[PDB]
């Protein structure tokens, strides 16, 4: 079971850091649950393996290569030449995310979202986890 959270900025909110959380079982291709927030409110959505198959086979692409791309985009595997961009409307609960080359954008995928009724609870969970994570590296560095 893998979790991966990512600090993001929606284009609609340049000054607000949004946070993209990803949870999945070793494999983003199999399907995942996604959660977005901005410190006052949070949203969640879901995508399946067949959705990714359909996306990748409308990418004209081998699935897996598009999965590596997704690893770059959503799990922060992007490189210095990589410029992804994220767009979401809180009113419509519709997300999509794109790729910037040739001075142009390329929508990579797009998700149906929903606002969570308990933002604060997912928030506590995420940040407890993060605290734990911090602390571990701290102890390790000490020993080293």
């Amino acid at each position: 079971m893998e979790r991966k959270i990512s600090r993001i900025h929606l284009v609609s909110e340049p000054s607000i850091t949004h946070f993209l959380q990803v949870s999945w079982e070793k494999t983003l291709e199999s399907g995942f649950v996604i959660t977005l927030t901005d410190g006052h409110s949070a949203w969640t959505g879901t995508v399946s393996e067949s959705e990714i198959s359909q996306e990748a086979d409308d990418m004209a692409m081998e699935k897996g290569k598009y999965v590596g791309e997704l690893r770059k985009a959503l799990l922060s595997g992007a490189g210095p030449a990589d410029v992804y961009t994220f767009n979401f409307s809180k009113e419509s609960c519709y997300f999509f995310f794109e790729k910037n080359l040739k001075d142009v954008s390329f929508r990579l995928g797009s998700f149906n979202l929903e606002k969570v009724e308990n933002p604060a609870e997912v928030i506590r969970e995420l940040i407890c986890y993060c605290l734990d994570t911090i602390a571990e590296n701290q102890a390790k560095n000490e020993h080293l």
């Binding site: 409308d58 990418m59 004209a60 790729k99 990579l108």
Partner: protein, 211 residues
């Protein structure tokens, strides 16, 4: 558009490797559309397309991750997997390429090119270049006779050769045209797959198109 045509006219010939055969193509691309001409060295085909057809056809062939036709045009400028079919005479070139880091596909529905433009693009140009080449041969020949005059000037008074391997027989066209006919005309005039033409003659091609 007509700019596409006129630029194409000045476009030299490329050479294409299909898995089935080879091809020669001259193409003129703009952000406005494209001007192509393709031939298999027995038949020629033509296709001319603007950004609207580009857009709709890409959508059909390639759907989502959508873009400006000019972006595709730019990638085509980059210039992948090529295939074609001579459906009735629509030589539909089928090209799989890598665009946006991903597989791309387009069909050039190249109908038989028109005899007017066929003149305009091969024959009139070919005839022009062949004649210009003959003028080049004549001028190099007169230069070699100037050189023969200069060498015979040495030969009339002293001027013995030191390097016993620099001898040149006096230049006379007919015999060398004959030896060209016999020894090397077969290998030369071999049509092949259109490669030597795209290799060496494109300079003169563009020049003759300009003139």
């Amino acid at each position: 558009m007509e700019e596409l045509e006129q630029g194409l006219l000045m476009q030299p010939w490329a050479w294409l490797q299909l898995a089935e055969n080879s091809l020669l193509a001259k193409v003129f691309i703009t952000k406005q559309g494209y001007a192509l001409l393709v031939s298999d060295l027995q038949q020629v085909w033509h296709e001319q397309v603007d950004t609207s057809v580009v857009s709709q056809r890409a959508k059909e062939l390639n759907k989502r991750l959508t873009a400006p036709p000019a972006a595709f045009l730019c990638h085509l400028d980059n210039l992948a997997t090529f295939s074609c079919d001579c459906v009735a005479d629509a030589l539909i070139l089928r090209v799989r390429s890598e665009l946006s880091g991903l597989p791309f596909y387009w069909n050039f529905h190249c109908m038989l090119a028109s005899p007017s433009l066929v003149s305009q693009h091969l024959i009139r140009p070919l005839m022009g270049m062949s004649l210009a080449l003959q003028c080049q041969v004549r001028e190099l020949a007169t230069l070699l006779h100037m050189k023969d005059l200069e060498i015979q000037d040495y030969q009339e008074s002293g001027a013995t050769l030191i390097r016993d391997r620099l001898k040149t027989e006096p230049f006379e066209e007919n015999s060398f045209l004959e030896q060209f006919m016999i020894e090397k005309l077969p290998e030369a005039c071999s049509i092949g797959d259109g490669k030597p033409f795209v290799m060496n003659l494109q300079d003169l091609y563009m020049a003759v198109t300009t003139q």
